[model samples]
Target: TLRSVCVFCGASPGASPVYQEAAVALGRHLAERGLTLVYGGGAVGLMGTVADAALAAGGEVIGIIPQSLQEAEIGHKGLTRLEVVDGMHARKARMAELADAFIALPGGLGTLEALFEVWTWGQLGYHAKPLGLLEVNGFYDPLLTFLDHLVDERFVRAEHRGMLQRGASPEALLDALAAWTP
Candidate 1:
């Protein structure tokens, strides 16, 4: 039932080759499975790599970007559709509306912010969509530990914490997401 996936990733590629490779792998897998990629409309970093890979694999890619970023010229021009929205919140909301599920790849503050917001929305019953982390070389290990701490501290319930699936490979993560139920 997972037809489209929204991915939150860095606008700038991280300081490693694994991140780039992982993005490509995710794009290719999504295309091979006939899945659409919904993401931030940018032509740099993991964003560009994933979009380009999906396009190359003959998959539909949608990019939601703010007008300011569009004017900055980072908007991905080669997507199947590049939507220029009003602002950051608009972009995120549009992306959420368009996607059936969500995944967070290796990224920075913006990526974390997006992931957290969506997860919070899920926690608050705003949406029942599933979300996960693409754990590239233990990229999410520390965060996972901290999340467990939240559970231990009684700030987060175990059932809610279980909502976030973790997978090390694209196939595994996608399959897990597809099989998830709220």
Candidate 2:
């Protein structure tokens, strides 16, 4: 049943070689585990690294990209499916619809935005899909700490916080997501 996992990652590879290494490792793990890849259609940086690794390991890939980004020359043409949406919101929606679950890799604002959107939707009973952070090299520790503060401050309810799962490795994160019911 684990047909596809949507990965939200940076268009720019971070300064650390560890981030890129994690990206490739995750891709290979997903491919060897018989999961397909779904991601933003950018053939550059960490995004491309993940997609390339998956493809090299004989996994299917689906790319959802906005026309604006395509105009900016960031579109990937080698995916098993390249869906061109009209805008950023539509692109995110399309990706969510295609994915069985969501995973956030090392990334910037865009990755966080996508993670939050899916989490919000899941908590609202819009979809029961699982959402998680790969936390490569502890890149997301600060953000996770901030979220804990929110929970402690009563700004976010603990029950609703079931929407997020954190794991240090891709295999662990994916394992949690696979077992999650809501």
Candidate 3:
């Protein structure tokens, strides 16, 4: 029953083709499912690829970018609607408001930061939404191990781990999330 999904992904293309492929697949899958895309308003890297794919597939794409980034000429103008927010926090808040679920694709620091923030919010019961990781080509194995370590160290409860789901395919992960109820 997800009407919209928030994607946190790299602003720059990653080192692996699998990452880009997964990004496109995610966009296509969302579009096919009649889900809107809400994401950072970046015109480069995986951001552009996903937005473009979704738009071409007849899905609505909503971009939320900070004024500074938009001024830097990196915002995706092709989005169905773009919101220029005051700052990063505002951008994230806007995306959250527009989405019913959150998905993290392969990316760098910025993507990880956004994913963690949303995951933390879900863990703390601030939101009741499914969070997913598109673990293309085992790209997120190390992070998964680190999370397991946290659970083992009592830093986080093992049951809370269920809040995040990982898979190598967007369709599989999305299917799982769609059936998940918090």
Candidate 4:
């Protein structure tokens, strides 16, 4: 039932070369598995690599981007579905409406915030779709530990924090997502 995936990732590929490989491989996996892609619609950074790979593999990709960041974000030229919006709220709402699940690839605060909002919504009973972190090249290792630290500080329950499924590779993460219980 995992038809479409909303991917949160960086506008840039970052300082590491593996980050590029991870994004490309993740996109290829989604395509080979016949899952549609929903993303920020940027051609810059890791975002471009993913979209390009998916498209080249004959996969459907849906891009939801606000006009503010469309040009400013180095918007992608070719997309299966290009949905322009007024702002971030509309963008997020549309992606949420379209995706069967959500995953965050290696990215920065923007990607983190998008995943957090979706996770918060899940915690508050907004939806039951699986949430995941594709921790390419151990990019999210420190983040995982920090979340555990929050559990120790009593800011977050361990179970609640466990809601975000994570794996070191795209294939592993995708398998885990497919098995996520409602």
lDDT (C-alpha, whole model) for all candidates: 0.92, 0.87, 0.87, 0.88
* TM-scores for all predictions: 0.97, 0.95, 0.95, 0.95
Question: Residue by residue across 34-153, what tens digits does model 3's lDDT show?
Answer: 999999978889999899889989999999999988856388878889998898888887888888888999888999999888888888888878889998887899999999899989
Candidate 2: tens digits of C-alpha lDDT, residues 59-150 = 89898999888756377777788889889999988988899999989888888888898888887788888888887766788998899999
The residue pairs found clashing in candidate 4 are: 12-45
lDDT of 1 by residue, 1-182 (tens): 99999998987888989999999999999999999999998998999999998999999999999988775638887899999889999999999999999999999999999999999989999898999899999889999999999999999998788779989899999999999887
TM-score of 3: 0.95
Overall local distance difference test of candidate 3:
0.87
* Candidate with the larger TM-score of 3 and 4: 3
By the lDDT metric, which is better: model 1 or model 4?
Answer: 1
Over the full model, what C-alpha lDDT does candidate 4 score relative to the true structure?
0.88
Cα lDDT tens digits, model 4, 1-182, are 79999999999789989888888988988998899999998888888989998998889999899999877887788999888999998889899999988999888899999999988887888888888988776678899889889989999876677668998778788888888875
145 Cα displacement, candidate 3 (Å): 1.0
